[PDB]
Amino acid sequence: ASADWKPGHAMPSLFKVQNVNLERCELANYPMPRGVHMNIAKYMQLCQYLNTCTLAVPANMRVIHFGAGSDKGIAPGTSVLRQWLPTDAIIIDNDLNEFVSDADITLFGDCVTVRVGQQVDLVISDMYDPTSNESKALFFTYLCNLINNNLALGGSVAIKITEHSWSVELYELMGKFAWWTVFCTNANASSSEGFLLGINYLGTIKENIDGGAMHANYIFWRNSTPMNLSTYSLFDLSKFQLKLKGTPVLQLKESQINELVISLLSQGKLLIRDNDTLSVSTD
Amino acid sequence: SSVLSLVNFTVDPQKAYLDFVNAGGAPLTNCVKMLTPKTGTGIAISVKPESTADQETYGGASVCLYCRAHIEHPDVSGVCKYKGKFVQIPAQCVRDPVGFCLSNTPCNVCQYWIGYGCNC
Numbered sequence A: 001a002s003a004d005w006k007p008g009h010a011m012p013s014l015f016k017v018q019n020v021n022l023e024r025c026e027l028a029n030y031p032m033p034r035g036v037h038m039n040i041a042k043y044m045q046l047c048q049y050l051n052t053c054t055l056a057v058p059a060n061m062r063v064i065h066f067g068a069g070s071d072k073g074i075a076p077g078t079s080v081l082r083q084w085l086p087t088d089a090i091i092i093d094n095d096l097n098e099f100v101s102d103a104d105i106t107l108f109g110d111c112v113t114v115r116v117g118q119q120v121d122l123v124i125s126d127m128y129d130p131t132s133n134e135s136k137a138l139f140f141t142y143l144c145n146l147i148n149n150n151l152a153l154g155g156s157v158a159i160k161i162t163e164h165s166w167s168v169e170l171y172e173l174m175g176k177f178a179w180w181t182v183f184c185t186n187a188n189a190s191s192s193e194g195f196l197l198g199i200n201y202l203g204t205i206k207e208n209i210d211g212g213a214m215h216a217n218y219i220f221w222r223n224s225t226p227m228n229l230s231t232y233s234l235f236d237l238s239k240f241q242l243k244l245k246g247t248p249v250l251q252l253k254e255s256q257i258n259e260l261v262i263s264l265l266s267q268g269k270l271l272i273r274d275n276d277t278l279s280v281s282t283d
Numbered sequence B: 001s002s003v004l005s006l007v008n009f010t011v012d013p014q015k016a017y018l019d020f021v022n023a024g025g026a027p028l029t030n031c032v033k034m035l036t037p038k039t040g041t042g043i044a045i046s047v048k049p050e051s052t053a054d055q056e057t058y059g060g061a062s063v064c065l066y067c068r069a070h071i072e073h074p075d076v077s078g079v080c081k082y083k084g085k086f087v088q089i090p091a092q093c094v095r096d097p098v099g100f101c102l103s104n105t106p107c108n109v110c111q112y113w114i115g116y117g118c119n120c
């Protein structure tokens, strides 16, 4: 099947517009190996999907990766990010537990101890706490505040959610990006996991989203959609690396952000933020 | 987690790891093996995966003993030579990447593993 050769499935507007109750997530297949850690395939498929999105990719690209550690004490996703991102990207990663990684900066402890001094360009979160299905707080409060304060205009996010690990306010914040979806890797298609993607942050409400209803739409989509476990998309890695776009970084007052600027931000062609030296430290 | 304990009770962690695996100890597991187009130059350590068809590529920190055991790096600069980079291993040596890296050195002017690619 065509879709088996894609990196995964993205939630279609067919399900985004529905109006249904939140139901239990029932997946038929709830297993492919690849020699490497499973998270290698999961992260590479998320990266492959992001390759099809209008991501801003500047020089000295600022990337933070939360939940980068594992019970093995290593960080396969961070290494995929290293392989994917430009050589001059700065990677900062974080986990509650000690681990070792190929990041430029690695911070141990709760993500709330991570003090971002300057806005960043890309946030990846794989945070998940294993411990009626109500909206959840946890580290989602921290991530929401990060989107509102420490994310460049034009920046993007990819935030892991599941059937039970999700946030009303985070879905609503997807309405402040030029485009958004939920992306589910083929490598982990039998899990209710998905990555909530916000592509090109605009700082202003573009779509009014009821976050509780939209999570119900996400589960309705998962319940409606055969997905086969697969890693076929990783057979040809010849174009895996993130395109070196040289996206410009501009400082602008909000007074100066006009229709041209919004259009450039929405097309992945501009970032607005400080051009300082990035300081990211544990408080 | 046995060999990781062992290299902490010693002054010469390189020798202790190597003697341990040379006497049948289990290699350190969970080295981060990447998936790559096996079209690289084949140099030992690199910014991006550079594995040939004869090699596999690992995330650098996961194959560094000193990183995995959270002990002082022996480099005079204090700076790890693998971490944040990719390390190419011969595909005959995949059973113990950490052991291979402790057992070998890259050529200082060609950058390929001596005995495994360096044609100097």
Ligand SMILES: C[S@@+](CC[C@H](N)C(=O)[O-])C[C@H]1O[C@@H](n2cnc3c(N)ncnc32)[C@H](O)[C@@H]1O
Residues within 6 Å of the ligand: A039, A066, A067, A068, A069, A070, A071, A074, A075, A076, A077, A078, A094, A095, A096, A097, A109, A110, A111, A112, A126, A127, A128, A129, A138, A139
């Ligand atoms: C499935 S694991 C990540 C696997 C990892 N991304 C990889 O590359 O293999 C989920 C991680 O979320 C981390 N986590 C959960 N809550 C956190 C928090 N509040 N702050 C920082 N990390 C958190 C956990 O410690 C755990 O390591």
Ligand SMILES: [Zn+2]
Residues within 6 Å of the ligand: B061, B064, B065, B066, B067, B068, B073, B080, B081, B082, B083
């Ligand atoms: Zn090291």
Ligand SMILES: [Zn+2]
Residues within 6 Å of the ligand: B107, B108, B109, B110, B111, B112, B118, B119, B120
């Ligand atoms: Zn040589």
